[PDB]
Design an enzyme around this catalytic site. Structure first.
Site, PDB file in Angstrom:
ATOM      1  N   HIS B 113      40.799  28.514  49.385  1.00  0.00           N
ATOM      2  CA  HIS B 113      39.715  27.565  49.568  1.00  0.00           C
ATOM      3  C   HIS B 113      40.272  26.147  49.721  1.00  0.00           C
ATOM      4  CE1 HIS B 113      35.633  25.888  48.912  1.00  0.00           C
ATOM      5  NE2 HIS B 113      36.276  24.924  48.281  1.00  0.00           N
ATOM      6  N   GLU B 114      41.128  25.738  48.791  1.00  0.00           N
ATOM      7  CA  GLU B 114      41.701  24.395  48.827  1.00  0.00           C
ATOM      8  C   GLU B 114      42.505  24.116  50.092  1.00  0.00           C
ATOM      9  OE1 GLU B 114      40.768  22.050  46.850  1.00  0.00           O
ATOM     10  OE2 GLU B 114      39.529  23.575  45.895  1.00  0.00           O
ATOM     11  N   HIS B 117      40.594  23.102  52.932  1.00  0.00           N
ATOM     12  CA  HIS B 117      40.335  21.666  52.976  1.00  0.00           C
ATOM     13  C   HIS B 117      41.567  20.930  53.505  1.00  0.00           C
ATOM     14  CE1 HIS B 117      36.471  21.753  51.061  1.00  0.00           C
ATOM     15  NE2 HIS B 117      36.915  22.109  49.869  1.00  0.00           N
ATOM     16  N   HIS B 123      32.995  22.341  53.462  1.00  0.00           N
ATOM     17  CA  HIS B 123      32.266  23.447  52.863  1.00  0.00           C
ATOM     18  C   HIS B 123      31.349  24.137  53.864  1.00  0.00           C
ATOM     19  CE1 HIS B 123      32.825  21.725  48.535  1.00  0.00           C
ATOM     20  NE2 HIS B 123      33.806  22.540  48.874  1.00  0.00           N
TER      21      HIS B 123
HETATM   22  C1  LIG Z   1      37.435  33.065  47.110  1.00  0.00           C
HETATM   23  N1  LIG Z   1      36.346  32.092  47.224  1.00  0.00           N
HETATM   24  C2  LIG Z   1      36.405  30.834  46.653  1.00  0.00           C
HETATM   25  C3  LIG Z   1      37.468  30.261  45.917  1.00  0.00           C
HETATM   26  C4  LIG Z   1      37.330  28.939  45.403  1.00  0.00           C
HETATM   27  C5  LIG Z   1      36.132  28.169  45.610  1.00  0.00           C
HETATM   28  C6  LIG Z   1      36.007  26.755  45.069  1.00  0.00           C
HETATM   29  C7  LIG Z   1      34.996  26.688  43.901  1.00  0.00           C
HETATM   30  N2  LIG Z   1      35.068  25.432  43.109  1.00  0.00           N
HETATM   31  C8  LIG Z   1      33.905  25.124  42.236  1.00  0.00           C
HETATM   32  C9  LIG Z   1      33.015  23.976  42.702  1.00  0.00           C
HETATM   33  C10 LIG Z   1      33.008  23.526  44.056  1.00  0.00           C
HETATM   34  C11 LIG Z   1      32.172  22.452  44.460  1.00  0.00           C
HETATM   35  C12 LIG Z   1      31.331  21.819  43.517  1.00  0.00           C
HETATM   36  C13 LIG Z   1      31.326  22.257  42.172  1.00  0.00           C
HETATM   37  C14 LIG Z   1      32.163  23.327  41.771  1.00  0.00           C
HETATM   38  C15 LIG Z   1      36.158  24.566  43.146  1.00  0.00           C
HETATM   39  O1  LIG Z   1      36.229  23.535  42.493  1.00  0.00           O
HETATM   40  C16 LIG Z   1      37.327  24.961  44.078  1.00  0.00           C
HETATM   41  O2  LIG Z   1      37.267  26.297  44.589  1.00  0.00           O
HETATM   42  C17 LIG Z   1      35.047  28.739  46.347  1.00  0.00           C
HETATM   43  C18 LIG Z   1      35.164  30.043  46.860  1.00  0.00           C
HETATM   44  C19 LIG Z   1      34.172  30.828  47.630  1.00  0.00           C
HETATM   45  S1  LIG Z   1      34.788  32.493  47.549  1.00  0.00           S
HETATM   46  O3  LIG Z   1      34.740  33.133  48.831  1.00  0.00           O
HETATM   47  O4  LIG Z   1      34.285  33.176  46.399  1.00  0.00           O
HETATM   48 ZN   LIG Z   2      35.815  22.848  48.183  1.00  0.00          ZN
END
Ligand SMILES: CN1c2ccc([C@H]3CN(Cc4ccccc4)C(=O)CO3)cc2CS1(=O)=O
Ligand SMILES: [Zn+2]
Ligand SMILES: CN1c2ccc([C@H]3CN(Cc4ccccc4)C(=O)CO3)cc2CS1(=O)=O
Ligand SMILES: CN1c2ccc([C@H]3CN(Cc4ccccc4)C(=O)CO3)cc2CS1(=O)=O
Ligand SMILES: CN1c2ccc([C@H]3CN(Cc4ccccc4)C(=O)CO3)cc2CS1(=O)=O
Ligand SMILES: CN1c2ccc([C@H]3CN(Cc4ccccc4)C(=O)CO3)cc2CS1(=O)=O
Ligand SMILES: CN1c2ccc([C@H]3CN(Cc4ccccc4)C(=O)CO3)cc2CS1(=O)=O
Ligand SMILES: [Ca+2]
Ligand SMILES: [Ca+2]
Ligand SMILES: [Ca+2]
Ligand SMILES: [Ca+2]
Ligand SMILES: [Ca+2]
Ligand SMILES: [Ca+2]
Ligand SMILES: [Ca+2]
Ligand SMILES: [Ca+2]
Ligand SMILES: [Ca+2]
Ligand SMILES: [Ca+2]
Ligand SMILES: [Ca+2]
Ligand SMILES: [Ca+2]
Ligand SMILES: [Ca+2]
Ligand SMILES: [Ca+2]
Ligand SMILES: [Ca+2]
Ligand SMILES: [Ca+2]
Ligand SMILES: [Ca+2]
Ligand SMILES: [Ca+2]
Ligand SMILES: [Ca+2]
Ligand SMILES: [Ca+2]
Ligand SMILES: [Zn+2]
Ligand SMILES: [Zn+2]
Ligand SMILES: [Zn+2]
Ligand SMILES: [Zn+2]
Ligand SMILES: [Zn+2]
Ligand SMILES: [Zn+2]
Ligand SMILES: [Zn+2]
Ligand SMILES: [Zn+2]
Ligand SMILES: [Zn+2]
Ligand SMILES: [Zn+2]
Ligand SMILES: [Zn+2]
Lengths: 159, 159, 159, 159, 159, 159
Positions: B113-114, B117, B123
């Site tokens: 995910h990171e 970015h 997103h």
């Molecule tokens: C494998 N996948 C991930 C992994 C990581 C993340 C995000 C989630 N997150 C929480 C968040 C995001 C945005 C706002 C509040 C909290 C993070 O901080 C960073 O990683 C989102 C998702 C969607 S998924 O397909 O299930």
């Molecule tokens: Zn993110």
């Protein structure tokens, strides 16, 4: 987390606060760096041309990085951890009245704290640490890093 | 918006979380990058000396960029879009308990995910996209980018 | 810190999300409150006229309290601790797709967490606690407060 | 989301800006409310003693609600959605130069927008809506709510 | 801007910090209020049942109002300006070590500043004002409001 | 505070808004830079390959720097002060409808303001200054920097 990958680190004073004489600022900043180089293998040099690792800036309110200062008192300054570009840069809130003494806000003491950040140190929970987030004036002659500050800075650069 | 103007992109692991063994971190991160290079012409290489395009850092709370993490849970990490200096860097909240499994917070999944970015993706509103802002554990063996992720990343780098 | 000084607490559903049927929302919210009243001397009643202690609201983005939601995913909702006026109110991000099942974001599970805040509980560092800041779907039939949740809520209201 | 559950709504002017004469402020505010009561069953009354539903306040920078204004220009004011206590209150940035004309920032026009929030309306994406987040002076004699404003406000209070 | 419309103002201590004995907290808070009532017609009374105008709360990090404290040091407390519900409430960061002396953070001195906010005063740019945003310990026996504090508080309540 | 240490400054248009034709964007941006070079010794050049000092980007919401835009209206853009990496970069909120005329939000006028920041200028309190934080359309043919803008920019680069 972030840390410099070299011992020779340069700094440049971007602009000067009108609160003090230019040489007073240069001296206070130089003494602040020396506090850290005294307990590590780090060496700091002031440059007047070229790109410095650590840029020192005096500014009030919104000053270009989207993290505006708050006027006189409160937050006195802030600095970015080790890194290129903005990394390491130290910004001092011009709305404070900077001094070489106990009045206003002491530049040297504040600079020691900020440079701590510039070098990669975060806030400490030890009341005696220069990295403790609450300002308290102490004469420069008796000022000293706490064991916590020493341990932290040496865990990063040794010596 | 921001996008890398080259295919060879390097990353460097600044520091390691004590939650996992060093090689576990190296592997998880490498697999995360591979997920993206598998659907683009991008090539990623890990370096141990020199300036990397993408710096990976593990840190808690206030860590030098003025966007402090929030402790265990909630925000798991954050990363800057393509660019020099801080651009592309990925920061992982050390207050999370990173793992190679379903417990704590899976490093590999979060890194995918990171890095999304880091490469210039924002997103997604598609529940199946890895770029969807809500974390959900899935075994690495069955994990896969969604069509939305593919389209987005390829609209930027092709292949 | 903040805590209600009474056992009879009322709630009112300000508006309904179009994602679910009205009765689905009423039920999910009622079940969420019951989770807490089951382990304390607290009693919750839904009212349709008059001023309720806890107002439940569904809204997206900027919705009147200067703490805007962030779109689909991420932050799912937020609530104020015990108090008059806004105190205790629970707001659910309408940009989420609320459901009675494992798809989208489960209203009941999220409501349990939010009401925890409404009652005066903060986030927990225990991975098993409903007050842990990271969402994870679990069938309602097997959902249960963790010992940490119980201890915390009972330290405030007993039973 | 939040909405008033009554037709008789009162407002009280907490303090006056020195930029205009007291009666100029009273008039501008009264006209702003009338814009909304003209298209709904709502009735507004100014009170000088007792607790008003909507408190009008003029203040600069940090003024008691943890959402400080930003000095001259930019954000001109802000207001809380329907509710008790702080709910509905409208705050006007004293750092702006309020006027009854095209100079400085027109109080009446800004008040119409803010009261829109006080009544439960959020920002509109329609360029013609008074609730559109970008200020644009228009003579009071030709000012008029857009169809979008009407629809929104009537979806809440009818008429 | 915001101001209380009465002379009899009540306060209630919601919870106590474990840093000090209960009676030490009650005394420090009572002395803090007295500092203000000494130069105005205001009268403060502590209540243990019912709704108080000013609620005193000790809490760390996120505590229910969406403005979380920052851990030991830095921000020591915050308070809302005059008003119903949350208005006037004073919150003290439990991560600080509260004391009746020069160690840790002095509760009395901090409470004087916070109550200043509770009564409607903002920050002062006068270095001698208790409302100046930078904390500096001073023995309670020699502590005194500055002329700036007096003028400000009396401009609101007279005497 | 921050200031460029050279006269030859380059800019690169990272991506284009679909609201206007590519050449319309190039022209508006070029004219915006010319406004500043007309009153200083600064020279601006557009490059299509390599690292530019000032990167122009069009993006909506969260776009990689942790300072997300707010949708249509309100904040129209933002830019970092002089510096390497992100320094000087100008970001334009894609949720705005950019135009070459009085409709939507005029790109040229907004770009002049943003570039002012890119060059090291902060907000002005002079209602006539292009650096005043409140947008007001003016035909490009009659647009002109105010004396305040001139003084400020020349205090930094002379001429
Ligand atoms: C494998 N996948 C991930 C992994 C990581 C993340 C995000 C989630 N997150 C929480 C968040 C995001 C945005 C706002 C509040 C909290 C993070 O901080 C960073 O990683 C989102 C998702 C969607 S998924 O397909 O299930
Ligand atoms: Zn993110
Ligand atoms: C000499 N020492 C300094 C100097 C400066 C600072 C900090 C204080 N501060 C206030 C602050 C910090 C964090 C949050 C709110 C307010 C600054 O902004 C920057 O400098 C802290 C400390 C601890 S000390 O040993 O007494
Ligand atoms: C049933 N349970 C829930 C439900 C809801 C929530 C939170 C999650 N969340 C995301 C979040 C929280 C904090 C910071 C960033 C993101 C919310 O917004 C509100 O609900 C957390 C948890 C822990 S759990 O035992 O799995
Ligand atoms: C008469 N009309 C007003 C009056 C006031 C406002 C807003 C503008 N604003 C600026 C703002 C809003 C949102 C974000 C940044 C800046 C305010 O603060 C409060 O008033 C918007 C509009 C649209 S309009 O039809 O031209
Ligand atoms: C006795 N006095 C106090 C007590 C408390 C405070 C403030 C300081 N502070 C730190 C702060 C304020 C604003 C911004 C950052 C940090 C608080 O949080 C609350 O109390 C300021 C002052 C000025 S003083 O005359 O020395
Ligand atoms: C041509 N001129 C512009 C153009 C653009 C802007 C600003 C306005 N703005 C709104 C804003 C600024 C600050 C805070 C809230 C809202 C932007 O975001 C960026 O551009 C201000 C001004 C003053 S002007 O002489 O009329
Ligand atoms: Ca300051
Ligand atoms: Ca630097
Ligand atoms: Ca100064
Ligand atoms: Ca930032
Ligand atoms: Ca976290
Ligand atoms: Ca980088
Ligand atoms: Ca960890
Ligand atoms: Ca708030
Ligand atoms: Ca959300
Ligand atoms: Ca309530
Ligand atoms: Ca929805
Ligand atoms: Ca303003
Ligand atoms: Ca109100
Ligand atoms: Ca004014
Ligand atoms: Ca603190
Ligand atoms: Ca109160
Ligand atoms: Ca404590
Ligand atoms: Ca916008
Ligand atoms: Ca740049
Ligand atoms: Ca657009
Ligand atoms: Zn700064
Ligand atoms: Zn610090
Ligand atoms: Zn970070
Ligand atoms: Zn809310
Ligand atoms: Zn929560
Ligand atoms: Zn306000
Ligand atoms: Zn608005
Ligand atoms: Zn608080
Ligand atoms: Zn204060
Ligand atoms: Zn940006
Ligand atoms: Zn600006």
């Amino acid at each position: 987390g972030p840390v410099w990958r070299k011992h020779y680190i340069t700094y440049r004073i971007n602009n000067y606060t009108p609160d003090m004489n230019r040489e007073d600022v240069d001296y206070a900043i130089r003494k602040a760096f020396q506090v850290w180089s005294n307990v590590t293998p780090l060496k700091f040099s002031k440059i007047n041309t070229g790109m410095a690792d650590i840029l020192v800036v005096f500014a009030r309110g919104a000053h270009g990085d989207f993290h505006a200062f708050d006027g006189k008192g409160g937050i006195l300054a802030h600095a970015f951890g080790p890194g290129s570009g903005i990394g390491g840069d130290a910004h001092f809130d011009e709305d404070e009245f900077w001094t070489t003494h106990s009045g206003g806000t002491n530049l040297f003491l504040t600079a020691v704290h900020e440079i701590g950040h510039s070098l990669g140190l975060g806030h400490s929970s030890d009341p005696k640490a220069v990295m403790f987030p609450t300002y308290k004036y102490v004469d420069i002659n008796t000022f000293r890093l706490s064991a916590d500050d020493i341990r932290g800075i040496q865990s990063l650069y040794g010596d």
